[PDB]
Design a protein around this ligand. Structure first.
Ligand SMILES: CCCCCCCCCCCCCCCCCC(=O)OC[C@H](COP(=O)(O)OCCN)OC(=O)CCCCCCCCCCCCCCCCC
Ligand SMILES: CCCCCCCCCCCCCCCCCC(=O)OC[C@H](COP(=O)(O)OCCN)OC(=O)CCCCCCCCCCCCCCCCC
Ligand SMILES: CCCCCCCCCCCCCCCCCC(=O)OC[C@H](COP(=O)(O)OCCN)OC(=O)CCCCCCCCCCCCCCCCC
Ligand SMILES: CCCCCCCCCCCCCCCCCC(=O)OC[C@H](COP(=O)(O)OCCN)OC(=O)CCCCCCCCCCCCCCCCC
Ligand SMILES: CCCCCCCCCCCCCCCCCC(=O)OC[C@H](COP(=O)(O)OCCN)OC(=O)CCCCCCCCCCCCCCCCC
Ligand SMILES: CCCCCCCCCCCC(=O)OC[C@H](COP(=O)(O)OCC[N+](C)(C)C)OC(=O)CCCCCCCCCCC
Lengths: 124, 83, 654, 481, 89, 85, 182
């Protein structure tokens, strides 16, 4: 009943109980059940989408709402990446020149050819 | 500690706290088979062992590169980046 | 006596013999036998490493053919070289220690034959993973260690949460393996082979777009294996398995395979400077996120696992700097003290009657467990890169490389890495204080019964404590030496900068991480012992941000609601609305309904009539007249008659 | 001989009253005979070897020694020998998997099962379009009767599906075969690559052949009959339908389509890739929301068949070799999974709903180990023939079209998901409250499962062992100028 | 060791099936010989790399280039393309 | 390992109650004493005591079962009913 | 092998006739009747006839023996299933360890399994005549026929020289077969 996908099935039942679904993980685990691990009692009706609400379904997190958690996750990524990118601007310059190598950058040692020295060849 | 368990349930792994009464004799058999297997494997795979370097001579390597150059000159083959 | 053959074949026996003979042998013999086999493997490995440092001429073992189809020739080939021997040092040492530790730690458990067979299985397949000489053998090991991880995380089968944790791990690593298969297809197409020799022979001539495609797929695979911030979630769930499993998986072998896959590919990765960049910044993100989550966690194993995540991020940063030797050395060093941390945590947990893992539920144990204190202390100070310890010689130089890197922008990484480092101290001290210094938080009987563990637990911790004090210093020249040629990876000369990162470094940067570590460690301890309010405030906003960090930067919710749950809803839509909806409509259900109406209409064409003669005569007249008029229409224009015939069919059948 | 052997059959039936021991003996002899044929098969030759003709006008009841060929032709090359070996390996196992659970009217049941096996085996020997089509259709009434009389609760709808869908596709194949017959006045497979039809007529003939392929494989979107038919069939029916009958479609692609309609096939390949990618992705996702064990296992076959299609239509040697290897490995592993769900669990509990099953490891550790092994084999763990087939098929697909094959690489994940989701619940957790403890797997069930696992492991470790029969085949059908 | 005589599609009449079969087998066998040549080049390249190490870029340049050149042209291609098409026209 | 006995549970609970300052008297604490009546413990005070009991024997009392225990003997039989404590 | 006896059979029928139907023949769970059930059920595994009589005799004897065996099998298996005791040893012994062969074992273990082993052996040794080996040898022979002097060279030099010649020259004949492509 509660979610959009359980509602969408409402035309698809005729004479099947319209069960309001509750995630089995959120049932209090100190009550007693015929199957304690699944937190189910015998002959208990199943929602049409029961496979998405039983104990083997993906875990549900209660502390935050899903929307707010999305806000926090996007915000963390945004602030981290934006801060790093901005920091790239305010950077000191190095003090030593990048090193160099004999034979025009050892272009022969890294394969290379007379006719093709830009492809293979170091800073020389 | 421990608890009851069904005795009819036969598992290749032994089940619950499997500690057979004749385990020392069975262990002697198992270690003998282990030693035999390891030594057979170590000896049989010996001919397929080799070192990585110094197995082909400079003559072969140099002449193979020369022949490949010959092949690439018979065809029209420029080098990478050579344009 | 062939070292390579024995190194492969002995863990195979320690794996398979328990499965064949467990009921006949019993867990007493099986535990002792598997441990002995792994010990002999470790000794053979150490001897091989000694000789290889003598003479860097790797052994190859070339066996039967796997595939010899059109141009693709794949063989079961193995080699032990410098990279492989470093991996094997970690793998075999930690595996032998974990095997010895498990005799004590699992003594009560009914199912010890299966457990020890699985630990040996993991060792064997990881050895296969690192010793293979082509990407196919690597993949064989890659998939089998995933299978073994599934069997280990779900070892306690009756526990629902453990089974779900195992499903998480196996599925996220199958996502990685899907990208691995993509990469293998690209590699086989572009290079005609999977052998390392040929790919490293010709990779410098290859088109760069193709190399980026290959390396990107391989990096997504390694990302899932090494729990970078994309696909980390299973790493902390893996703490559902028994503690010795966590010691093996998070220190030596499983989470290191990703790093290995990048290290083995360094020759290709030199020519893909774009994916090196992505690797670098992914690692910076990973180390930051891991440290932040760790500061706000209360489960001991979870904090240690998040520390593993931060260290893997640090190795990935090193890879992205092309200081592959640095990442390799940090992998090898991190394995030892991470294994020690996990084993010490296992001791602490077994020292409580409740066997609670909540750091909020210990609190005075220094007097009661001095030896576990000293082991965990040594491991922590190794992690914090304190002077003269193994972690110093790896962590600090990796931190400094970022400043010394030629790429200017990489300076930002320095600060990120540094923050991670100090963040590390904060959680280490937090578990050190809350476990040993604080004030007792458990009830009185636990302190009465709090004792140390047996020799089977204690001896491995002693051995790994020695390792975590001495290995880094005794090995620094092999991996970080001014011109060491042991790991022979071909670093492009323009890229190589290990000299610049030593000569160009100033006192401020070379000293600031160390001083910050020392100062923060003292700060955390003194603020806990004297100003508990600053940590134990009650601000609504701070509690909110703390809650964010405590729930893994809500990542696990984000994955579970927006991908996995959405995916199951979409699967329901496909299975009900398409497979059992539209497809049955253009199928048995729709055709049945159609034929029912059509048949009813045609049989009732003469339904209500009473005199069959009159009706049938009217039908013959109507037929004749209609045929005449239809043919007249056809003579006029045949197209005009098509609608009329459609209408007549509609009249008859509908 | 035939007279004497018929007397033997009659007397055995008179005295024992159960025909099944005789059928097991006959099928085992057939397997040995095929192995002897393989011994005398020349591999350095791409020509059909053990040829014979039936129903020639000069000898309607014998073998044809005439200079005019107007009967039905039979013979084998390496490709057909591969599938024949798979068939004769599987038939005795399908007899043995129903040894004890068929009690009323069992002689008819075993007769139907053996007849279906023999018809498929003959189908792989057929050397012309008409003989192929005849043996292709002849299984449908036998399957209809078998499913209707010996299937589970919904077996009437299932028998009607297995007849009607397959007839539907086969009649369009029949249109194509009639067109070939009247246009070429020849129908045989020995020289049909020598006839080059105009591109337009090729394009038309291809459509009928491919509609039949789409229903028989099956491919999206005409697959929905297979889960029903598999779910309601008795065990031997399911084993034959998943292990053998679906392979007839792959064989049909290689034997009937590629040699004759080469240019049209080139033109149509992107459409095939669309259909196969849809099959893989959509059926893999639809499996996630199934609640019947046998339905889940049945849905798995469709995705693996999609991968095989992508391989076999890749115009590469690696892709065709991968498609054939995948077909064989699936023929090993899928009958084993059907044995587990519809032979072992169903004979103990007589129910297939997933909610009832949980934590079988406690009382049945051996069955749980079999489940784990067969699951990781089914999702393509390396050293299994399934991995070799899938990997080579994806290589060929990626070469044929990098984007489409690259996206196809997600099947690794998707298959892992549905299969391991099932096995996680089957083995883990506390023993279910709804079922009582039963026996662990028996000696017969273990024997069947062991045969299948050893076969898939042998071709997984050394796939090259099939190459001596197939190296001509991986070049016979690619079209490169 | 067998050495069947080589037959070309361009010479034969497609109505002698023996000649057509021989032409198909000849085409396939020649492709497999080409694959053998490529494998020889690749094996030499692997040996050169493993004995050269850091100077493989110099000592194996010809082998690397030749392997990469022969990779696209020395694979299996079938016979149907050539038998069903006449290149002259 | 470690195993508790009914008398150990009783001795721990009695020492626990003796430590509480809100109690009427220490000498009057019986096995079948009522905390509400004999010890005169408030509504919230018995809650504090149940919380102390669960913090002492390392278990977790649900709301419905916490409010049910009214006597010390009830507490002891509850704590002995629980396997891990 | 001939083992039939009509004299025994026509009396076995009546020895069956006294007993209750095998469905209800053990539903008590006296011991004398159970002992006779044990003996008569033990007759199921005492094979009563061989080949020379099924082939030669007639269908009335066959129908009777068939019926007898039907009821014997029912008695044996029902006693085994309810009591948990094998009907040998002759009063219903418990000794289930061993001495229990199913009717499929001989076929599947001495015909089917050896056939599969033979198939594996045949595939292994058939793979030796694979095209990859033939083409290796053929390339070598073509090189040796074009350049016979590398025959004069010693063994260990020879293979390196064949490799050299292969690398340098395009010894295939694919383009030769492509006559019309000029
Ligand atoms: C390469 C091929 C290698 C093939 C290995 C051959 C295995 C032969 C022996 C397997 C025996 C394993 C077994 O029986 O485990 C059963 C296990 C319950 O056993 P137990 O711990 O004793 O008791 C618990 C409750 N009774 O129940 C379980 O928990 C199931 C775990 C089974 C572990 C199987 C190990 C193999 C995994 C690799 C499969 C790869 C598939 C490809
Ligand atoms: C960047 C995006 C990263 C995506 C990573 C790949 C996602 C697939 C991983 C699926 C998975 O791991 O789900 C496992 C889930 C267990 O999760 P959980 O219940 O929370 O574990 C409890 C243990 N503490 O158990 C399950 O829920 C299994 C049920 C099916 C899960 C998959 C459903 C399909 C959804 C699409 C998955 C990804 C599709 C391709 C991408
Ligand atoms: C140009 C000349 C050449 C000839 C071409 C002429 C083309 C047009 C011919 C028109 C002639 C009229 C045909 C009359 C038959 C229609 C009978 C009818 O009205 O049945 C419609 C049927 C409604 O059934 P109902 O139960 O009410 O709806 C629920 C469906 N799930 O609805 C259905 O159930 C149909 C669902 C099946 C969908 C198609 C199934 C496969 C196609 C058959
Ligand atoms: C109702 C469905 C439609 C029915 C239409 C088709 C009905 C066919 C009836 C089945 C009969 C076919 C099998 C028997 C024919 C083979 C007899 C034979 O001798 O094959 C000839 C072939 C060459 O022999 P030859 O030239 O004489 O030289 C011998 C040198 N020593 O020698 C060989 O190379 C051996 C050939 C082996 C062929 C394997 C056959 C496997 C199956 C045999 C029984 C199949 C029964 C199927 C029953 C269901 C109906 C389909
Ligand atoms: C729907 C169901 C439809 C069922 C369809 C089944 C049709 C079966 C038709 C049977 C004809 C095919 C028989 C295969 C030929 C095998 C054979 O050769 O049998 C031996 C003999 C002729 O042998 P010959 O010609 O001499 O060649 C062998 C030389 N080495 O052959 C003979 O002497 C004739 C013996 C066969 C008699 C068949 C009688 C019909 C069945 C009653
Ligand atoms: C079980 C852990 C590993 C144990 C390894 C011990 C090896 C000792 C001797 C090895 C000799 C060897 O493998 O040779 C393999 C021989 C000939 O190969 P080759 O070309 O002459 O040389 C190989 C080395 N080359 C190429 C570098 C020179 O062909 C075979 O037999 C393969 C037969 C396949 C049988 C079907 C597979 C059955 C799988 C059964 C799975 C349960």
């Amino acid at each position: 009943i509660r979610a959009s996908f359980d509602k969408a099935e409402e035309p698809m039942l005729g004479d099947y109980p319209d069960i309001d679904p509750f995630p089995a993980q959120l049932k209090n685990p100190y009550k007693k059940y015929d199957d304690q691990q699944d937190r189910r009692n015998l002959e208990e009706p199943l929602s049409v989408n029961d496979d998405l609400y039983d104990m083997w379904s993906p875990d549900r997190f209660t502390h935050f709402k899903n929307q707010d958690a999305l806000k926090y996750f996007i915000g963390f990524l945004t602030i981290f990446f934006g801060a790093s990118y901005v920091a790239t601007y305010f950077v000191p310059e190095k003090a030593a020149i990048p090193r160099e190598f004999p034979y025009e950058g050892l272009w022969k040692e890294s394969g290379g050819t007379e006719k093709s020295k830009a492809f293979f060849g170091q800073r020389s | 500690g421990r608890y009851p368990f069904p005795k009819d349930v036969i598992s290749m792994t032994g089940g619950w706290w499997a500690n057979p009464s004749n385990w020392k004799l069975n262990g002697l058999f198992a270690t003998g088979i282990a030693v035999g297997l390891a030594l057979w494997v170590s000896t049989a795979t010996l001919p397929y062992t080799r070192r990585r370097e110094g197995i082909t001579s400079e003559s072969d390597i140099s002449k193979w590169n020369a022949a490949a150059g010959v092949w690439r000159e018979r065809h029209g083959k420029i080098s990478t980046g050579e344009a | 006596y062939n070292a390579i053959s024995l190194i492969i074949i002995l863990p195979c026996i320690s794996w398979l013999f328990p499965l064949f003979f467990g009921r006949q042998l019993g867990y007493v013999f099986v535990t002792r036998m598997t441990s002995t086999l792994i010990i002999i493997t470790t000794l053979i490995t150490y001897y091989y490493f000694y000789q290889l440092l003598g003479n860097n001429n790797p052994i190859n073992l070339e066996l039967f053919n796997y595939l010899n189809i059109d141009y693709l020739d794949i063989n079961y080939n193995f080699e032990i070289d410098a990279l492989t021997i470093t991996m094997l040092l970690a793998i075999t040492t930690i595996s032998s220690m974990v095997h010895i530790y498990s005799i004590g730690y699992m003594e009560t458990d009914p199912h010890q034959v299966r457990f020890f067979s699985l630990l040996s299985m993991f060792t064997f397949w990881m050895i296969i993973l690192v010793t293979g000489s082509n990407y196919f053998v690597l993949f064989v090991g890659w998939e089998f260690i995933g299978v073994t991880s599934y069997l280990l995380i779900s070892f306690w089968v009756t526990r629902l949460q453990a089974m779900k944790s195992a499903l998480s791990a196996v599925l996220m690593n199958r996502f990685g393996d899907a990208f691995f298969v993509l990469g293998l297809c690209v590699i086989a197409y572009v290079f005609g082979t999977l052998n390392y020799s040929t790919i490293f022979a010709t990779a410098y001539l290859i088109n760069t777009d193709l190399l980026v495609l290959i390396m990107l797929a391989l990096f997504i695979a390694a990302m899932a294996k090494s729990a970078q911030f994309g696909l980390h979630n299973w790493l902390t769930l893996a703490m559902e398995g028994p503690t010795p499993v966590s010691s093996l998986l998070h220190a030596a072998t499983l989470v290191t395979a990703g790093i290995y896959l990048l290290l083995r590919s360094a020759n290709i990765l030199e020519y893909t400077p774009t994916v090196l960049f992505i690797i670098l910044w992914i690692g910076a993100l990973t180390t930051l996120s891991a440290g932040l989550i760790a500061i706000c966690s209360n489960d001991l194993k979870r904090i240690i696992a998040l520390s593993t995540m931060s260290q893997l991020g640090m190795m990935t940063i090193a890879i992205g700097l092309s200081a592959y030797n640095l990442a390799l050395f940090h992998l090898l060093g991190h394995a030892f003290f991470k294994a020690l941390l996990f084993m010490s945590a296992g001791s602490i947990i077994h020292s409580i009657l409740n066997e609670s893992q909540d750091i909020r539920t210990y609190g005075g144990l220094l007097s009661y467990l001095p030896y576990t204190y000293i082991c965990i202390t040594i491991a922590s100070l190794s992690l914090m890169a304190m002077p003269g310890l193994t972690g110093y010689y790896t962590k600090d130089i990796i931190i400094e490389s970022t400043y010394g890197s030629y790429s200017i922008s990489n300076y930002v990484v320095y600060w990120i890495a540094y923050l991670s480092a100090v963040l590390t101290c904060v959680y280490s001290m937090k578990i050190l204080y809350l476990t040993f210094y604080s004030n007792p938080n458990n009830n009185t009987i636990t302190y009465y019964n709090a004792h140390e563990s047996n020799i089977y637990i204690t001896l491995p911790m002693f051995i790994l404590a020695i390792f975590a004090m001495f290995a880094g210093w005794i090995l620094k020249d092999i991996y970080l030496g001014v011109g060491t040629d042991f790991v022979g990876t071909h670093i492009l000369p323009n890229n190589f900068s290990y000299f610049d990162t030593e000569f160009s470094i100033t006192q401020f940067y070379k000293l600031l991480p160390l001083i910050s570590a020392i100062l923060v460690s003292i700060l955390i301890v003194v603020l806990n012992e004297f100003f508990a309010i600053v940590f134990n405030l009650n601000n609504k906003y701070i509690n909110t941000v703390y809650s964010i960090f405590n729930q893994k930067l809500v990542s696990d919710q984000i994955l579970n609601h927006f991908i996995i749950f959405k995916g199951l809803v979409t699967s329901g839509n496909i299975a009900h609305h398409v497979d059992k909806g539209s497809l049955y409509r253009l199928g048995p259900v729709g055709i049945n309904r159609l034929l029912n109406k059509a048949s009813y209409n045609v049989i009732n064409l003469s339904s209500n009539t009473r005199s069959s003669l009159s009706m049938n005569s009217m039908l013959i007249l109507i037929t004749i007249v209609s045929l005449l008029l239809l043919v007249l229409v056809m003579n006029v224009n045949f197209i005009i008659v098509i609608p009329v015939l459609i209408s007549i069919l509609y009249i008859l059948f509908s | 001989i035939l007279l004497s052997s018929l007397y033997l059959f009659n007397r055995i039936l008179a005295w024992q009253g159960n025909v099944k021991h005789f059928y097991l003996f006959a099928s085992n002899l057939l397997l040995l005979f095929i192995v002897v044929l393989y011994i005398n098969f020349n591999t350095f030759s791409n020509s059909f070897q053990f040829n014979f003709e039936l129903f020639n006008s000069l000898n309607p009841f014998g073998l044809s020694n005439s200079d005019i060929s107007n009967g039905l032709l039979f013979g084998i090359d390496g490709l057909s020998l591969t599938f024949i070996l798979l068939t004769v390996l599987l038939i005795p196992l399908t007899l043995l998997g129903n040894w004890y659970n068929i009690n009323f009217n069992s002689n008819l049941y075993y007769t139907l099962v053996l007849a279906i096996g023999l018809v498929i085996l003959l189908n792989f020997w057929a050397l012309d379009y008409i003989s192929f089509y005849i043996l292709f259709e002849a299984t449908l009434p036998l399957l209809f009767i078998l499913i209707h009389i010996y299937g589970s609760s919904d077996s009437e709808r299932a028998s009607f599906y297995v007849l009607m869908f397959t007839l539907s596709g086969s009649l369009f194949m029949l249109l194509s075969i009639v067109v070939i017959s009247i246009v070429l006045n020849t129908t045989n497979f020995i020289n049909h690559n020598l006839f080059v039809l105009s591109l337009d007529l090729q394009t038309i003939i291809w459509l009928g052949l491919f509609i039949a392929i789409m229903v028989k494989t099956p491919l999206f979107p005409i697959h929905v009959w297979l889960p029903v038919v598999h779910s309601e069939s008795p065990l031997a029916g399911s084993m034959i339908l998943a292990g053998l009958i679906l392979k007839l479609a792959l064989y049909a692609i290689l034997r009937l389509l590629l040699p004759l309609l080469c240019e049209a096939q080139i033109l149509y390949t992107p459409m095939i890739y669309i259909i196969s990618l849809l099959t893989i992705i959509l059926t893999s996702l639809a499996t996630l929301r199934q609640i019947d064990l046998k339905v889940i296992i049945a849905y798995s076959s469709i995705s693996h068949m999609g991968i095989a299609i992508l391989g076999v239509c890749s115009n590469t040697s690696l892709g065709i070799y991968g498609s054939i290897v995948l077909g064989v490995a699936h023929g090993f592993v899928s009958p084993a999974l059907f044995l587990i769900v519809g032979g072992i669990l169903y004979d103990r509990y007589h129910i297939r709903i997933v909610n009832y099953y949980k934590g079988l490891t406690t009382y049945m550790p051996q069955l749980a180990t079999y489940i784990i092994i067969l699951s990781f084999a089914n999702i393509g763990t390396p050293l299994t023939g399934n991995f070799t087939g899938e990997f080579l098929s994806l290589q060929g697909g990626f070469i044929r079209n990098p984007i489409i094959g690259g996206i196809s690489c997600i099947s690794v994940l998707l298959a892992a998901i549905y299969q391991l989701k099932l096995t996680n619940k089957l083995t883990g957790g506390i023993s279910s409250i709804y079922m009582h403890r039963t026996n662990d797997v028996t000696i017969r069930e273990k024997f069947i499962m062991n045969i299948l696992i050893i076969s898939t492991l042998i071709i997984g470790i050394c796939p090259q062992i099939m190459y001596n029969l197939l190296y001509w085949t991986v070049n016979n059908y690619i079209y490169i100028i | 060791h067998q050495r069947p005589e080589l037959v070309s599609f361009d010479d034969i009449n497609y109505n002698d099936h023996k000649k057509v079969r021989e032409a198909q087998e000849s085409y396939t066998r020649e492709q497999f010989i080409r694959l053998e040549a490529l494998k020889t080049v690749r094996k030499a390249l692997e040996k050169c790399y493993e004995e050269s190490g850091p100077n493989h870029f110099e000592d194996c340049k010809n082998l690397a280039e030749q392997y990469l050149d022969m990779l696209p042209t020395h694979r299996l291609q079938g016979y149907l393309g050539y038998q069903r098409n006449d290149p002259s026209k | 390992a470690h195993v508790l006995t009914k008398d150990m549970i009783q001795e721990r609970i009695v020492a626990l109650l003796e430590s509480f300052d809100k109690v009427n008297d220490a000498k009057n604490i019986t096995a079948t004493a009522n905390l509400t009546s004999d010890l005169g413990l408030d509504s919230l005070d018995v809650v504090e005591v149940v919380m102390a009991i669960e913090e002492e024997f390392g278990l977790e009392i649900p709301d419905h079962d916490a409010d049910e225990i009214k006597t010390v003997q009830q507490a002891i039989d509850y704590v002995s009913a629980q396997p891990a404590a | 092998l001939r083992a039939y006896n009509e004299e025994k059979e026509l009396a076995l029928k009546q020895r069956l006739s006294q007993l209750p139907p095998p469905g209800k023949a053990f539903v008590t769970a006296k011991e004398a009747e159970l002992a006779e059930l044990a003996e008569i059920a033990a007759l199921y595994k005492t094979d009563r006839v061989g080949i020379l009589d099924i082939l030669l005799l007639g269908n009335k004897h066959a129908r009777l023996y068939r019926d007898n065996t039907a009821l014997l099998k029912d008695y044996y298996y029902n006693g085994r299933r309810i009591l948990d005791k094998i009907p040998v040893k002759v009063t219903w012994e418990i000794k289930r360890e061993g001495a229990e062969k199913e009717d499929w074992v001989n076929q599947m273990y001495f015909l089917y399994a050896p056939s599969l082993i033979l198939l594996l052996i045949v595939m292994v040794y058939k793979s030796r005549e694979d095209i990859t080996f033939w083409a290796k040898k053929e390339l070598d022979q073509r090189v040796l026929d074009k350049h016979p002097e590398i025959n004069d060279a010693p063994e260990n030099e020879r293979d390196a020289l064949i490799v050299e010649r292969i690398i340098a020259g395009d010894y295939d004949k694919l383009a030769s077969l492509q006559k019309k492509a000029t």
